[PDB]
Design the sequence.
C-alpha cells in the first residue's frame, strides 16, 4: 500500500497522493453557486467569529478581475497563492491582448498551474477546489469549478465543502426546468439551499451576487435577514 | 556638460560649535526653468544632513538608495550613524558604479552624535572623500563660490556671523551664475536646535 | 526513527541532531571566560598526549581583529573553519565602513554562518561552541554562541568537561567588579579545579582584552601569574 | 581590415514550361579581375524533379547547398516521402530569414515540376522573400536578360501577335541565344553553358561552349 | 506512518509536519497584545533569568522593525533571526519603490507567503516560529496580527501565544472591554493576565517586559519602558489585590 | 509601392499595386502585396518584402492556435496587438514594416495600422507606401461613409491609378479586395494600361 | 512636438491634450487620444517616441490596477507618481531605454488635488502648472501671467482658451482639436471638446 | 521490485509502464473505424449530473481541420498531449506550406510520450485514437503510454476494450461504406454500455475526403438512433 | 536480492544484475537474422501482429544509403538510438563529405550506451541492434547488446528462440561467401522458419527483407516484393 510518492502508479492504476488531496477539500467550508438569467450568485457558510478578532481578514470570496469572482475550499495557505497568482494572469492577459479576460481563459490557467505542480516530487499539490463565476464573456453568464487533480469543468449549479453531497442531491430536486427569473427568486433559491446548511444558524450566511454589469455586491445582514424572513413566511403558507 | 544640464549649487561651512549648509531652489532643463521648490538637502538623522547637486535624476536616485542603506544600518545597531561612517557609506555606493557612474557630487555636514564636534566633507562623482576645516562647495558655479569663501571665512564664529557669512557667499556667487538661482535655502544646525531660513534672492 | 535526519521534526519536541551536536561540546577541553570591570579574561586547557608534541604549534586563544579574541570547546578541526570565516567577514565590514567592527556585530553574523549548516540535508552542524570577547566603546563584552545559532552575553561562564562544577564554582565566585588582575587569579583557580597533573606554563593558555586592545599572553607572563597563584 | 563578403559573378536563368522546366548557367568562376576556373556549374540536382541555382558569394553557395541536402534527408526519414517543389521553396525562405542580421549573399532560383506535372519557378532574394513566376534571370547579367524574355515569352509590347505556348524545342534556342548576346557585353559570363532540363522522364543535361575571353 | 518530508499528505488527510510544528509552539515563552484606543501594547516573559547574564540589548522579544511597527517572537531562535532580518528588508524595499511606509497588512502577507513556501517545496523544514504584530497606518489605525507556522494569519483585538496561553485567553474574554480602551486601563489588565500564567510569586519586574506604541503629533513613538516604571505598575496591582478582598 | 484601405457602411476595401523595384531596376510587375492571412483577415506589404512576409505568416500561425484552443475566432484588435508586440522586441535592429490589418469583427469592421516603430493605431482611412501621399488627395476628396458598393470600387481603383501615374516606384496591376461580414472576397485585378484607356476616354 | 497642459486648481485639476497622430508630412489621425485612466482619480498623459508611449504607459496602467484588486484600496497620487519614476530610472542604463515625457494628475481624499511633472530623464516635480512639447514655449508665459492660486473652474477653462488661441496664431503646426478632462472629488469628468474655427 | 521506472525485472520488464496501461482500463470506451469513404468515430460520455454541463466533457477534440482525436484514461495527462499535437501540425505548415500527414503527427506526439525518465517524471496515463484523411486516403492510428505507435483498421479502447474488439472483428470487412460503418459501430456501443442509449450518452465524429469540415454530428445523431 | 536494485551496486560475486536483466529484455522481441556474402549483406526480420486486423509492427528501418539496422527489444530505446544514429551519419556527410565507415560508427554507439551503464539515474538501453553496412572494405554484419559489447560477425540471429536459427547458420556458414544475391536471401529465411512453431508458416504479411549491396543502396521490401523471394521454397520437413 504505497502512498508515499506522487510519481508512482498503483497496480490497479491510481495516484493516491492526488486522491488524498481531495480529502482535504472535504474539511473546508461549503460554498454553492448558481447562474441565473442575467444575475449570477454564490453563497458561503461563514464560520462563527470568536468574539475577539476583526473579521475583514477572513475573506473567502474574492474577485480576480472586475467581472469575475471566486470561491474556494480547502486550506487558506494554498488558496492565497492561487488567488494572488491568478490576479496577475488576468491582468497580464489584458496587456498582451487588449480584451478583457474571459471566464474560460482564467480557469484554464488555474487548472494548468495546478497541473504542472502535481507532476514533480517535492511539490505538495494544492489542496483547494475553486468556483469561478462570471457573466463576463459578452453578456453570457458562466460558472466553472476546479479540482486538485487540475481538471476545470463546467456546471450549472455547484456545491463544495463538508457535506456537499447533501446539497448537490438537494439542488437536483430543487433546480427547476423553469429557469428562475426575477433575480430575487434566484437569490431565494440559494438562500433556501444554504438554509439546508450543516447548521443553518441563519445569521451565518454571506451571499455575493453580480448583476452582469455592476461590480461585486456583498449583501448586508439586514437585506439578507429580509430574505430569510420571507422564506419562512412562504413556507408556512404551503401548509 | 551633463553636470551643466540642470545646474545646482551646494555649500557647507564649519562654525565654532555649529555647522551650516545651503543650496539653491531652481529646477530646470538646460535653459527653461520648471519650478522653484526642488529639494537638494536631505535629512539623514538628527544634526546630520546631506546635500546633492548635479544631474537631477541621480540627485533623487542616490538620496533614496542611501536612505535604503541607512535604515537597515540603524536597526541592526541601536545607535545612530557617525558622520565618518556615512562618508564611508556614500563612497562605497558611488564606487560600485565605477564605470556607469551617477552624475552627482555630494556634500555632507553634521555634528557628532555624542560630542558637539562639527564635520564637513565632499566627494567626487566616483567617491574620493575630502574632509576640510573651513568649507566645501559643489555644483556648476564652483569657482564663484571659492572666491567668496576664501575672503569671508573666519575661524571661530558664532551662529549669528556664520549665518551672515554663508548668506553673503551664496547670494553673490549664484547671481553671477546663469543656470542657478530662483531662491536660496539655508540650514543652520547646532546642539540645541535646527534653524531653517530662506533668503530674499533675485528671481531672474 | 527521527534521530537520523535533520530536516524533520519529532512529534512532541525539537530537533534531535542539534541536541546530539551539543553533546560533542560537553566532551571537549574545559574553558573559562570572565568579564571583569575593565577587561575580559579568556582561559583554556591545553594538555598534549605525549611529551613529543610541541606546544608552540597550535594555539587556542586566537585574535580576529586587534581588539577581538576567541576560544572554543568542541572539535579543533571544525574550529579552524569558522575562524577563517570570521576573519574574512570582519574585513568586509571594514572595507565598507572604514571602522573596526563592534563585537555585537560579528556575533550577529557568525551565528548566521552556523545557522546555515543546520539546513537541509546532507551537511552536518558544527560541534563547536565559542566564547567571543572584545572591548568596544569603553565597555567590554563577552559573548557565547552555539551550533544551533543562538548567542548570549555572560558575566562569567565555563564550557567543556566538568563545567557544572565550574558553573557552581563561578556562581559562588563572581562579584560585580574586580580588576583585570584579580580576574586572572580567579580564572586560573577555576581551571585548576578540574585538572589532572602539574599545571605549568604550557598546560594552560590565556588571552585578555584590555581597552588598549587584544593580546594573548607569552609563556613567561603565564608562568609568573601561575607562580604564586594562591 | 577584414571584410566577410566578396563577389564572384555568375548568371542563372530559369523558364517554367507547360510540362517542363529549364535551368541554365555559365561555368565561369571569377574574382575581381581574375579567373579562378572555367568549369564551375551553378546547377544542383536536389531531387529528380527539382534543380536549384545559386549565385553571388561562392562560399555561401557551398554552405547553403549542403544545408538543403541535409534537410531533404531529415524530411524523408521523418515523413517517408520526398519533398515537393513548393515545399522546398517554403523551407528555404525560413532558412534565409534565420540569418536576417548576418545575411547570405546568395541569389536563388528553384525550378522544377509541381505535383500536377507542370513547370514551376520560384525566385528569391538574399533575405528570403519569394514568389512563383514563369521565368526569372538572376545574377550579374540579370538586367541584360529580363527585357528580352518579356518580348519573346511574355509577348509584351507586341501588337497582333497570337499567344502560342512555348514548346520545348523553341525554348532551347531562346536559352542558347540569350547567353551569346549576354557574353558579348558582360565580363562575368562565358567559357561554357550548362543547361538542365526537367521533364517527367528525368533530368537531362547539355553543355554548349561560349567565347573564352 | 507519515513521518517523511512536508510533502506528503496523509490519507483521511492532513499534514503531520505542520501539526508537529504548530503544536511545538506551546513550549515557547509567552507574548500577548491588547485592545487599545489611541495606542497598542505588547507584553512578554523573560525566560532563564539566571544571574550570570548581561542583557546588553535590553530588548529581546521585541523588535522594532520598520518605523511604526514592532513584533514579538515565539519559537526556535535559529529561525527567529532569519525572519526578522528578512522582514525589515521587506519594508525598506517597499519604501524604496513608493516613498511611503508599508501599510501593515501586506507586510504580513509578504512574510506569510515566505513561511508558506517551505511547506510546499521539499525538502525544507517549516518555520517553527509564531509571532505577533503591532502597528499604525493611514487606513485603519492601530492593528494586531497573529502569525502561524502554516502561513496563516488573522487580525485580532486581543490575543496571546506561547507557554500556558490557553487559559490566558479566557481571562481576556472575561475582562473584555470595548469603547473604554485607554492605555492605563490596558496596562492594568496586562499585569493581571501575566500574574495568572506565571507561577512565579510577586511577579518580579526582571521577569517581564512591556512595550507600547502611541501616536503623538505625527510621529508614532515606540516606548520600551524601563524597569523603574514597571515598579509603579506592579505595586498598583499588588495594592488592588489587597483592597479587593475587603468585602469578605 | 502604394496601398490603401478604408472602411465604410458595407465593409472594408483594400487595394494595392504590384511593382517591386531594386534601386532603379524593376524586379517584377506581378507582386501580390496583399497577404491573405485567413478567410477573415487581410494584411498588406508596405516597406520591406521578407519582413512583411515573415511576421504576418507568423501571425497566421498564431491566430490558428488561438482558434483551436478557445473555439472562437480572434478579434481584429487582438491580432493587431500581437503583431505589435513581436516587432517591438527588435526595435532599432533595422526592420522595415508598415502594414495594415483588416477584417470583420464582433464589433463590426476593423482597420488597424501597424508600423515597425510600434504605431498601433486604428482609424477609418489609411494609405501606406512611397506613393501614399498621392492617394490621400484623390481618396479624401471622394470619400464618404455612405458610399455604394460599386461606387467604392471605382474610388479605390481611381486612387491607385493616380498614384502610379505620378510616382515612379508604383505600377503593374491594381488588385482589389472586399472585406464582407462573412469573409473577404477578391473583386478584380486590372492593368494600368487598360485603365489608362478607360479613364482618358 | 505635440502638446500637453496642466492647470492646477484649489480642489480640481484641469488637463488637456491634442488629438493628432501625424506621419512625417500627413496627419493620419485627427481624433487620437493621449489620456490613460490609471484609476478612478488618477490620469496619465504620455508624449514621446512612436512605440515607447504605448508600451510603457500600458505597463503602468495594468500594474496600478493590480494594486487595487490585491489590496482592496487605491494608491495615492503621490505614490502612484513616484512608482513611475522608479521604472524609468531602472530601465535607463540599459540597452532598451524609454523616451517618453509624462505628467500626472490626481486627486486625493486626504491631500486634495495634485499635479506632477516628468522628464524623459525621470525627474519628478510638483508644479502648479506644466506643459510639454514645442508649444510649451509659447503658451506657459500666458499661463504664468494670469494664474491665481485661488482660481475657479470657470476661469480655468477661460484661461485654457486664452492659452490655446495664441498657439493657434503663432505656431507652425496645425493642431485643430483639443480634448479636455477635469478631476474633482467625484472623479474624472469629461468636459466638451475644444475645436477652432480659424477664419 | 518495481516502485520506479529506473529498474528492471528479472524476467523483462516494467512493472511501471504495465501499471500505466492499467490506468487506461478505467476510462470510457471509444470506437473508431477506418473505411475507404472516410473515418468515423464514436465515444461514450458517462455524464454524472444533470447540472453537469455536457459539452465541457471533451472526448473528441479537433487537432487540425482534417484530423480528429479520441482519448481515454487520465484527462490531466490528455490535455498536455492535445496541446502539443495542435502546435506540431501548425509549425509544419509554417515551414512547409502543407498539411502534416496523420502518421507523422503521432511521431511528434510519441516523442514525448517517451521522455518520462529519459531526461539528462512518470509516464502518461492516456491512450489515443487518431483518424484523418491525408494524401494516402483515410487513416486510423493508435498509441499508448509506452509510445508504441501502430496502425489499426478498427480499434476500440478504454473500458470494455476486449468486449468490443471480439464483437468488432465479426462485422468488419474491407468493402464497408461510411454510412454502414456508423450504424455498425453504435450497435456495439449499446451492447457494452449500461444505460439505455439515447442522444445524450454518445457523440460522433466523421472525417471525409471532400468534407474536411464537420468532424461532428449535431442532433442528426437523433436520426441515426431511430435508424437502429 | 539486496544487491539487485541499481546499476551502481556490484555484487559479492562481481556480476551486476541490472545489466544481466537487460539481456533478458532482448529475448522478448521477435527473431531476426543477418548474414553476408562477399558482395551482399542481407538482414531478414520477423514481424509480429498486435491483433487480427491491426498492422504488423515494423522491424527493419533505413538509416543511410549504405547502412540499415534491425531491432529487438524496447521500442523506446529503438527510436532513441535511431535518432542518434541518423545524426552522426549526416555529420560526416556535412563535414568530411564522405559516408561513414561502418566500424567506427558502432564504436560511437558503445561509447553512447556505456555512460547509462555506470552513472546512477538512468537505466541501460534494452535493445538488440543488428547492423549491415558498406565501408570501403566490403559488407559487414554487426550486433550489439545492452552490455555495450559490440561484436563483428559473419552471421547472427537474436531475439526469441533464436538459438534454432544459430544452429542452422553454423552448418551453412561455409556456403554463404560464394552464393549470389538470390539464394543468399533464401538461405537466410530458411533460418527464420526454425524460430517458428511448426504449425504456422512464414507468409508475406509477417516478414521483411532489407538488402544493401556493393552497387545497391539499402532497400526495404515488405508484403509485395517479398513474393519474388518466397517463391522457390520447400515445405517444412515434418
Sequence:
Amino acid at each position: 500500500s504505497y502512498d508515499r510518492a506522487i510519481t508512482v502508479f498503483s497496480p490497479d492504476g491510481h495516484l493516491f497522493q492526488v486522491e488524498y488531496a481531495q480529502e482535504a477539500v472535504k474539511k473546508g467550508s461549503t460554498a454553492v453557486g448558481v447562474r441565473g438569467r442575467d444575475i449570477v450568485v454564490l453563497g458561503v457558510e461563514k464560520k462563527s467569529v470568536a468574539k475577539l478578532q476583526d473579521e475583514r481578514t477572513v475573506r473567502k470570496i474574492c474577485a480576480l478581475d472586475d467581472n469575475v469572482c471566486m470561491a474556494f475550499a480547502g486550506l487558506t495557505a494554498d488558496a492565497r497563492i492561487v488567488i494572488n497568482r491568478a490576479r496577475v494572469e488576468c491582468q497580464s492577459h489584458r496587456l498582451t491582448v487588449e480584451d478583457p479576460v474571459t471566464v474560460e481563459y482564467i480557469t484554464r490557467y488555474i487548472a494548468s498551474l495546478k497541473q504542472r505542480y502535481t507532476q514533480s516530487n517535492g511539490r505538495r499539490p494544492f489542496g483547494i477546489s475553486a468556483l469561478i463565476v462570471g457573466f463576463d464573456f459578452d453578456g453570457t453568464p458562466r460558472l466553472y469549478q476546479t479540482d486538485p487533480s487540475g481538471t476545470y469543468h463546467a456546471w450549472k449549479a455547484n456545491a463544495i465543502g463538508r457535506g456537499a453531497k447533501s446539497v448537490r442531491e438537494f439542488l437536483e430536486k430543487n433546480y427547476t426546468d423553469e429557469a428562475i427569473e426575477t433575480d430575487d427568486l434566484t437569490i431565494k433559491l440559494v438562500i433556501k439551499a444554504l438554509l439546508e446548511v450543516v447548521q443553518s444558524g441563519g445569521k451565518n450566511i454571506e451571499l455575493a451576487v453580480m448583476r452582469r454589469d455592476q461590480s461585486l455586491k456583498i449583501l448586508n445582514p439586514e437585506e439578507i435577514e429580509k430574505y430569510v424572513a420571507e422564506i419562512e413566511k412562504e413556507k408556512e403558507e404551503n401548509e | 556638460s551633463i553636470m551643466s544640464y540642470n545646474g545646482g549649487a551646494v555649500m557647507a561651512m564649519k562654525g565654532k560649535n555649529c555647522v551650516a549648509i545651503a543650496a539653491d531652489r531652481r529646477f530646470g532643463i538646460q535653459a527653461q526653468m520648471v519650478t522653484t521648490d526642488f529639494q537638494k538637502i536631505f535629512p539623514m538623522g538628527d544634526r546630520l544632513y546631506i546635500g546633492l547637486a548635479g544631474l537631477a535624476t541621480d540627485v533623487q536616485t542616490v538620496a533614496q538608495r542611501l536612505k535604503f542603506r541607512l535604515n537597515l544600518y540603524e536597526l541592526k545597531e541601536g545607535r545612530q550613524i557617525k558622520p565618518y561612517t556615512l562618508m564611508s557609506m556614500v563612497a562605497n555606493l558611488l564606487y560600485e558604479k565605477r564605470f556607469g557612474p551617477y552624475y552627482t557630487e555630494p556634500v555632507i555636514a553634521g555634528l557628532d552624535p555624542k560630542t558637539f564636534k562639527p564635520f564637513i566633507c565632499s566627494l567626487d562623482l566616483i567617491g574620493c572623500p575630502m574632509v576640510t576645516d573651513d568649507f566645501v562647495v559643489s555644483g556648476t558655479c564652483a569657482e564663484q563660490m571659492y572666491g567668496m569663501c576664501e575672503s569671508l571665512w573666519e575661524p571661530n564664529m558664532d551662529p549669528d556671523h556664520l549665518f551672515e557669512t554663508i548668506s553673503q557667499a551664496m547670494l553673490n556667487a549664484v547671481d553671477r551664475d546663469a543656470v542657478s538661482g530662483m531662491g536660496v535655502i539655508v540650514h543652520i544646525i547646532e546642539k540645541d536646535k535646527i534653524t531653517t531660513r530662506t533668503l530674499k534672492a533675485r528671481m531672474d | 526513527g527521527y534521530s537520523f535526519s535533520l530536516t524533520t521534526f519529532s512529534p512532541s519536541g525539537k530537533l534531535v541532531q542539534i541536541e546530539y551536536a551539543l553533546a560533542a561540546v560537553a566532551g571537549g577541553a574545559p574553558s573559562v571566560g570572565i568579564k571583569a570591570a575593565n577587561g575580559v579574561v579568556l582561559a583554556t586547557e591545553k594538555k598534549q598526549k605525549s611529551i613529543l608534541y610541541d606546544e608552540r604549534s597550535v594555539h587556542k586563544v586566537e585574535p580576529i581583529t586587534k581588539h577581538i579574541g576567541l576560544v572554543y570547546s568542541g572539535m579543533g578541526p571544525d574550529y579552524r573553519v569558522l575562524v577563517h570565516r570570521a576573519r574574512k567577514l570582519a574585513q568586509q565590514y571594514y572595507l565598507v565602513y572604514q571602522e573596526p567592527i563592534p563585537t555585537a556585530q560579528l556575533v550577529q553574523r557568525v551565528a548566521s554562518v552556523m545557522q546555515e549548516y543546520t539546513q537541509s540535508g546532507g551537511v552536518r552542524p558544527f560541534g563547536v561552541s565559542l566564547l567571543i570577547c572584545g572591548w568596544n566603546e569603553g565597555r567590554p563584552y563577552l559573548f557565547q554562541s552555539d551550533p544551533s545559532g543562538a548567542y548570549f552575553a555572560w558575566k562569567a561562564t565555563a564550557m567543556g568537561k566538568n563545567y557544572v562544577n565550574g558553573k557552581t564554582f563561578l556562581e559562588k565566585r563572581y562579584n560585580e567588579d574586580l580588576e583585570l588582575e584579580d580576574a586572572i587569579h580567579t580564572a586560573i583557580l577555576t581551571l585548576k579545579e578540574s585538572f589532572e597533573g602539574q599545571m605549568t606554563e604550557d598546560n594552560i593558555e590565556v588571552g585578555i582584552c584590555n581597552e588598549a586592545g587584544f593580546r594573548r599572553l607569552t609563556p613567561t607572563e603565564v608562568k609568573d601569574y601561575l607562580a604564586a597563584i594562591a | 581590415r577584414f571584410s566577410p563578403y566578396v563577389f564572384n559573378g555568375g548568371t542563372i536563368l530559369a523558364i517554367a514550361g507547360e510540362d517542363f522546366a529549364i535551368v541554365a548557367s555559365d561555368t565561369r568562376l571569377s574574382e575581381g579581375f581574375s579567373i579562378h576556373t572555367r568549369d564551375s556549374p551553378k546547377c544542383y540536382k536536389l531531387t529528380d524533379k527539382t534543380v536549384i541555382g545559386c549565385s553571388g558569394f561562392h562560399g555561401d553557395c557551398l554552405t547553403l547547398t549542403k544545408i538543403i541536402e541535409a534537410r531533404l534527408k531529415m524530411y524523408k526519414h521523418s515523413n517517408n516521402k520526398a519533398m515537393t517543389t513548393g515545399a522546398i521553396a517554403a523551407m528555404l525562405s525560413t532558412i534565409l530569414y534565420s540569418r536576417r542580421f548576418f545575411p547570405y549573399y546568395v541569389y536563388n532560383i528553384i525550378g522544377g515540376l509541381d505535383e500536377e506535372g507542370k513547370g514551376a519557378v520560384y525566385s528569391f532574394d538574399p533575405v528570403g522573400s519569394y514568389q512563383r513566376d514563369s521565368f526569372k534571370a538572376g545574377g550579374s547579367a540579370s538586367a541584360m536578360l529580363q527585357p528580352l524574355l518579356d518580348n519573346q515569352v511574355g509577348f509584351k509590347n507586341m501588337q497582333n501577335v497570337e499567344h502560342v505556348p512555348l514548346s520545348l524545342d523553341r525554348a532551347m534556342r531562346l536559352v542558347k541565344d540569350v547567353f551569346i548576346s549576354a557574353a558579348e557585353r558582360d565580363v562575368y559570363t562565358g567559357d561554357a553553358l550548362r543547361i538542365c532540363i526537367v521533364t517527367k522522364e528525368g533530368i537531362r543535361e547539355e553543355t554548349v561552349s561560349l567565347r573564352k575571353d | 506512518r507519515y513521518d517523511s518530508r512536508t510533502t506528503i499528505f496523509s490519507p483521511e488527510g492532513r499534514l503531520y509536519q505542520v501539526e508537529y510544528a504548530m503544536e511545538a509552539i506551546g513550549h515557547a515563552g509567552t507574548c500577548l497584545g491588547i485592545l487599545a484606543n489611541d495606542g497598542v501594547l505588547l507584553a512578554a516573559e523573560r525566560r532563564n533569568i539566571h544571574k550570570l547574564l548581561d542583557e546588553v540589548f535590553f530588548s529581546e522579544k521585541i523588535y522594532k522593525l520598520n518605523e511604526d511597527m514592532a513584533c514579538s517572537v515565539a519559537g526556535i531562535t535559529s529561525d527567529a533571526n532569519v525572519l526578522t532580518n528578512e522582514l525589515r528588508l521587506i519594508a525598506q524595499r517597499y519604501l524604496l519603490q513608493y516613498q511611503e511606509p508599508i501599510p501593515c497588512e501586506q507586510l504580513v502577507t509578504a512574510l506569510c507567503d515566505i513561511k508558506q513556501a517551505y511547506t510546499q517545496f521539499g525538502g525544507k523544514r517549516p518555520f517553527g516560529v509564531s509571532l505577533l504584530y503591532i502597528g499604525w497606518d493611514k487606513h485603519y489605525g492601530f492593528q494586531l496580527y497573529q502569525s502561524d507556522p502554516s502561513g496563516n494569519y488573522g487580525g485580532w483585538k486581543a490575543t496571546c501565544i506561547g507557554n500556558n496561553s490557553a487559559a490566558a485567553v479566557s481571562m481576556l474574554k472575561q475582562d473584555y472591554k470595548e469603547g473604554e480602551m485607554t492605555l492605563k486601563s490596558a496596562l492594568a489588565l496586562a499585569i493581571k493576565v501575566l500574574n495568572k500564567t506565571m507561577d512565579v510569586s510577586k511577579l518580579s519586574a526582571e521577569k517581564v517586559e512591556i512595550a507600547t506604541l502611541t501616536r503623538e503629533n505625527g510621529k508614532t513613538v515606540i516606548r520600551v519602558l524601563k524597569q523603574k516604571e514597571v515598579e509603579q505598575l506592579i505595586k498598583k496591582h499588588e495594592e488592588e489585590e489587597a483592597k479587593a478582598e475587603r468585602e469578605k | 509601392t502604394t496601398t490603401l484601405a478604408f472602411k465604410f457602411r458595407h465593409g472594408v476595401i483594400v487595394a494595392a499595386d504590384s511593382r517591386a523595384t531594386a534601386g532603379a531596376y524593376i524586379a517584377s510587375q506581378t507582386v501580390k502585396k496583399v497577404i491573405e492571412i485567413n478567410p477573415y483577415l487581410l494584411g498588406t506589404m508596405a516597406g520591406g518584402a521578407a519582413d512583411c512576409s515573415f511576421w504576418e505568416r507568423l501571425l497566421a500561425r498564431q491566430c490558428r492556435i488561438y482558434e483551436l484552443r478557445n473555439k472562437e475566432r480572434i478579434s481584429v484588435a487582438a491580432a493587431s496587438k500581437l503583431l505589435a508586440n513581436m516587432v517591438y522586441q527588435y526595435k532599432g535592429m533595422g526592420l522595415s514594416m508598415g502594414t495594415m490589418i483588416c477584417g470583420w469583427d464582433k464589433r463590426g469592421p476593423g482597420l488597424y495600422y501597424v508600423d515597425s516603430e510600434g504605431n498601433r493605431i486604428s482609424g477609418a482611412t489609411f494609405s501606406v507606401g512611397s506613393g501614399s501621399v498621392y492617394a490621400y488627395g484623390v481618396m479624401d476628396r471622394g470619400y464618404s461613409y455612405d458610399l455604394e458598393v460599386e461606387q467604392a470600387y471605382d474610388l479605390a481603383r481611381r486612387a491607385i491609378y493616380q498614384a502610379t501615374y505620378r510616382d515612379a516606384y508604383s505600377g503593374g496591376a491594381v488588385n482589389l479586395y472586399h472585406v464582407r461580414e462573412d469573409g473577404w472576397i477578391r473583386v478584380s485585378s486590372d492593368n494600368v494600361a487598360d485603365l489608362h484607356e478607360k479613364y482618358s476616354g | 512636438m505635440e502638446y500637453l497642459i496642466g492647470i492646477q486648481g484649489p480642489d480640481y485639476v484641469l488637463v488637456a491634450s491634442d488629438r493628432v497622430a501625424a506621419s512625417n508630412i500627413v496627419q493620419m489621425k485627427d481624433d487620437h487620444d493621449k489620456m490613460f485612466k490609471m484609476s478612478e482619480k488618477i490620469l496619465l498623459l504620455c508624449v514621446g517616441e512612436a512605440g515607447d508611449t504605448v508600451q510603457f504607459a500600458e505597463y503602468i496602467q495594468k500594474n496600478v490596477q493590480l494594486y487595487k484588486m490585491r489590496n482592496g484600496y487605491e494608491l495615492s497620487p503621490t505614490a502612484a507618481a513616484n512608482f513611475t519614476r522608479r521604472n524609468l530610472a531602472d530601465c535607463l542604463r540599459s540597452r532598451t531605454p524609454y523616451h517618453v515625457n509624462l505628467l500626472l494628475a490626481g486627486y486625493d481624499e486626504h491631500e486634495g488635488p495634485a499635479l506632477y511633472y516628468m522628464d524623459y530623464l525621470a525627474a519628478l516635480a510638483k508644479a502648479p502648472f506644466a506643459a510639454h512639447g514645442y508649444g510649451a514655449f509659447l503658451t506657459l508665459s500666458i499661463l504664468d501671467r494670469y494664474y491665481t492660486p485661488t482660481i475657479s473652474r470657470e476661469r480655468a477653462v477661460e484661461l485654457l482658451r486664452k492659452c490655446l488661441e495664441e498657439l493657434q496664431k503663432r505656431f507652425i503646426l496645425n493642431l485643430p482639436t483639443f480634448s479636455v478632462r477635469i478631476i474633482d472629488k467625484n472623479g474624472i469628468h469629461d468636459l466638451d471638446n475644444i475645436s477652432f474655427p480659424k477664419q | 521490485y518495481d516502485r520506479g521506472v529506473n529498474t528492471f525485472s528479472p524476467e523483462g520488464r516494467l512493472f511501471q509502464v504495465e501499471y500505466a496501461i492499467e490506468a487506461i482500463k478505467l476510462g470510457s470506451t471509444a470506437i473508431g473505424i477506418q473505411t475507404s469513404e472516410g473515418v468515423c468515430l464514436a465515444v461514450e460520455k458517462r455524464i454524472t449530473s444533470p447540472l453537469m454541463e455536457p459539452s465541457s466533457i471533451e472526448k473528441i477534440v479537433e487537432i487540425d481541420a482534417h484530423i480528429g482525436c479520441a482519448m481515454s484514461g487520465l484527462i490531466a495527462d490528455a490535455k498536455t498531449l492535445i496541446d502539443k499535437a495542435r502546435v506540431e501540425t501548425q509549425n509544419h505548415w509554417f515551414t512547409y506550406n502543407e498539411t502534416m500527414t496523420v502518421e507523422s503527427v503521432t511521431q511528434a506526439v510519441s516523442n514525448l510520450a517517451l521522455q518520462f525518465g529519459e531526461e539528462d517524471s512518470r509516464p502518461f496515463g492516456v491512450a489515443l485514437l487518431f483518424g484523418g484523411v491525408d494524401e494516402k486516403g483515410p487513416q486510423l492510428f493508435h498509441m499508448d503510454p509506452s509510445g508504441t505507435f501502430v496502425q489499426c483498421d478498427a480499434r476500440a479502447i478504454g473500458s470494455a476494450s476486449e468486449g468490443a474488439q471480439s464483437s468488432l472483428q465479426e462485422v468488419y470487412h474491407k468493402s464497408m461504406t461510411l454510412k454502414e460503418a456508423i450504424k455498425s459501430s453504435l450497435i456495439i456501443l449499446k451492447q457494452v454500455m449500461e444505460e439505455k442509449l439515447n442522444a445524450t450518452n454518445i457523440e460522433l465524429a466523421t472525417v471525409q475526403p471532400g468534407q474536411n469540415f464537420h468532424m461532428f454530428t449535431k442532433e442528426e445523431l437523433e436520426e441515426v438512433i431511430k435508424d437502429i | 536480492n539486496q544487491y539487485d536494485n541499481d546499476v551502481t551496486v556490484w555484487s559479492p560475486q562481481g556480476r551486476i544484475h541490472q545489466i544481466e536483466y537487460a539481456m533478458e529484455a532482448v529475448k522478448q522481441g521477435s527473431a531476426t537474422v543477418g548474414l553476408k556474402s562477399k558482395t551482399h549483406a542481407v538482414l531478414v526480420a520477423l514481424k509480429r501482429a498486435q491483433s487480427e486486423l491491426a498492422a504488423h509492427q515494423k522491424k527493419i528501418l533505413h538509416v543511410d544509403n549504405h547502412i540499415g539496422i534491425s531491432i529487438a527489444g524496447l521500442t523506446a530505446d529503438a527510436r532513441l538510438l535511431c535518432n542518434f544514429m541518423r545524426q552522426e551519419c549526416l555529420d560526416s556527410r556535412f563535414v568530411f563529405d564522405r559516408p561513414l565507415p561502418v566500424s567506427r560508427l558502432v564504436s560511437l554507439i558503445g561509447s553512447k550506451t556505456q555512460i547509462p551503464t555506470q552513472r546512477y539515474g538512468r537505466r541501460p538501453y534494452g535493445v538488440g541492434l543488428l547492423i549491415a553496412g558498406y565501408d570501403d572494405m566490403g559488407p559487414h554484419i554487426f550486433q550489439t547488446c545492452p552490455s555495450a559489447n559490440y561484436f563483428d560477425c559473419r552471421a547472427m540471429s537474436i531475439g526469441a528462440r533464436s538459438q534454432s536459427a544459430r544452429t542452422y547458420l553454423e552448418r551453412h556458414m561455409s556456403e554463404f561467401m560464394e552464393c549470389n544475391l538470390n539464394e543468399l536471401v533464401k538461405h537466410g529465411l530458411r533460418a527464420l522458419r526454425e524460430t517458428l512453431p511448426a504449425e504456422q508458416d512464414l507468409t508475406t504479411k509477417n516478414v521483411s527483407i532489407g538488402i544493401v549491396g556493393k552497387d545497391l543502396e539499402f532497400t526495404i521490401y515488405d508484403d509485395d516484393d517479398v513474393s519474388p523471394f518466397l517463391e522457390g521454397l520447400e515445405e517444412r520437413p515434418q
In short: The helical segments of chain D are 58-79, 85-97, 146-152, 168-185. Residues 17 and 201 of chain D are 15 Å apart (CA to CA).
